[PDB]
Design a protein around this ligand. Structure first.
Ligand SMILES: [Mg+2]
Length: 406
DNA sequence: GAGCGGTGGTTGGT
DNA sequence: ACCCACCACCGCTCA
């Protein structure tokens, strides 16, 4: 749930992660900070086949993509209140990313971190994050349109635009929507009441009123008999019809379920404060660590496996190295050859950069046993956001720019 | 989780 | 008695 929510709030803006990451880097002068709920992986990585551990392999490639986007991720795990959690946490550490355990539900924690300013957006499986206080919420990190290929885009929902759009649904309203019609995930919901009726009750204002009331029987019995009377007669015309068959359980509205949404179990103030000092971390990618991980987990063994790690990892490391920080510069970028504004990044300016993968990664395939091909000591080419390049290798970008103006 | 067509119930009107 | 539009719910499909 909430089932049919997108008919009411819109299915969302659809947008390149690159574009979000780079717009934010341009506006706020630092990389986008993203809370990712580790639940999004369950039905997404199971399609992967072949080789060893194809599910954690896809996680690996998504992490390399995050490096390329220059995004500081914090992956949030559910708390007590077939990819191992331990293996995921290890791979997260190796990549210099952050792992965080929610005390309860991860989506609630993700929204909380956003509210408290630890992250700028949440990436989650659905828009429940909005009932929990999220303002910018992303879902469905995946490829675009008829292209069954690389995952470049996400679906963005803005709690502010939704509240001021046709649905009227803000945090308060949705809350009512699922007390009244969330009879599968929650107790004492109204049988026969679905999204339409619940929604037009939210609009009438019943969700605002309910959220501003002590959890004070005298006033919660009042609200109920306004709502109940209004459903029966539609005197104010808040509905499209009368609803006399709609029978309301004695125990509705369950105030303990209201508690679960308005005051969800999240980290303590002390924990929020530790995250302010420690996130994002000052961590670099553990290269030797990842070499050992990929040997053990994917059987990327011996020289072929060393060369495979290098090819896959190097564009990522380049971007990451750029965002850290008469002047060398070349130790990252050998040259630039072209510029484009591609539909896949929603016209984010990119420069065609050259680099030496093995040099950049710092692994020598020769120290490992031998068993049109890819040579990691030849120059490789990658498109990299012009903005990132300007921060990281400014005089190379300048030199290319004059080259162009001639 | 989210989209889809069928279906069975409700409502308000023929 | 019955139609009709709307709706919530169900199982089924991609995950
Ligand atoms: Mg959810």
């Amino acid at each position: 749930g909430i089932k049919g929510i997108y008919k009411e709030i819109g299915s969302g803006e659809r947008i390149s992660l690159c574009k979000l990451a780079i717009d934010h880097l341009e506006q706020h002068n630092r990389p986008l900070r993203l809370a990712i709920d580790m639940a999004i992986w369950q039905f997404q990585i199971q399609a992967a086949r072949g080789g060893s551990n194809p599910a954690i392999r896809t996680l690996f490639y998504r992490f390399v993509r995050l490096l390329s986007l220059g995004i500081h991720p914090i992956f949030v795990f559910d708390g007590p209140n077939g990819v191992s959690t331990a293996m995921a946490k290890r791979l997260i550490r190796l990549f210099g990313f952050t792992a965080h355990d929610a005390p309860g539900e991860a989506e609630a924690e993700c929204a909380y971190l956003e509210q408290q300013g630890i992250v700028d957006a949440v990436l989650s499986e659905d828009v429940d994050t909005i009932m929990f206080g999220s303002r910018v919420t992303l879902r469905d990190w995946s490829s675009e349109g008829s292209k069954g290929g690389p995952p470049t885009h996400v679906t963005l929902h803005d709690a502010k635009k939704i509240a001021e759009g046709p649905s009227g649904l803000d945090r308060e309203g949705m809350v009512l929507v699922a007390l009244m019609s969330g009879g599968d995930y929650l107790p004492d919901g109204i049988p026969g009441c679905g999204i339409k009726v619940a929604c037009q009750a939210a609009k009438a204002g019943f969700g605002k009123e309910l959220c501003r009331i002590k959890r004070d029987k005298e006033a919660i019995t009042e609200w109920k008999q306004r709502l109940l009377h209004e459903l029966r007669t539609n005197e104010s015309g808040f509905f499209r019809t009368k609803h006399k068959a709609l029978e309301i359980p004695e125990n509705f509205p369950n105030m303990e379920v209201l508690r679960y949404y308005t005051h969800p179990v999240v980290s303590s103030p002390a924990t929020i404060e530790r995250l302010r000092q420690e996130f994002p971390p000052s961590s670099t990618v553990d290269i030797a660590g990842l070499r050992e991980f990929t040997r053990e987990t994917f059987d990327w063994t011996f020289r072929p496996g060393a060369i495979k790690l290098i090819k896959v990892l190097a564009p990522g490391l380049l971007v990451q190295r750029c965002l850290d920080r008469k002047k060398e510069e070349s130790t990252l970028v050998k040259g630039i050859s072209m510029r484009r504004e591609h539909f896949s990044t929603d016209a984010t300016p990119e420069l065609r950069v050259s680099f030496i993968p093995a040099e950049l990664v710092g692994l020598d395939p020769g120290q490992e046993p031998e068993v049109k091909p890819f040579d990691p000591w030849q120059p490789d080419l990658a498109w990299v956001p012009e903005t990132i390049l300007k921060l990281g290798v400014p005089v190379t970008v300048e030199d290319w720019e004059e080259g162009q103006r001639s």
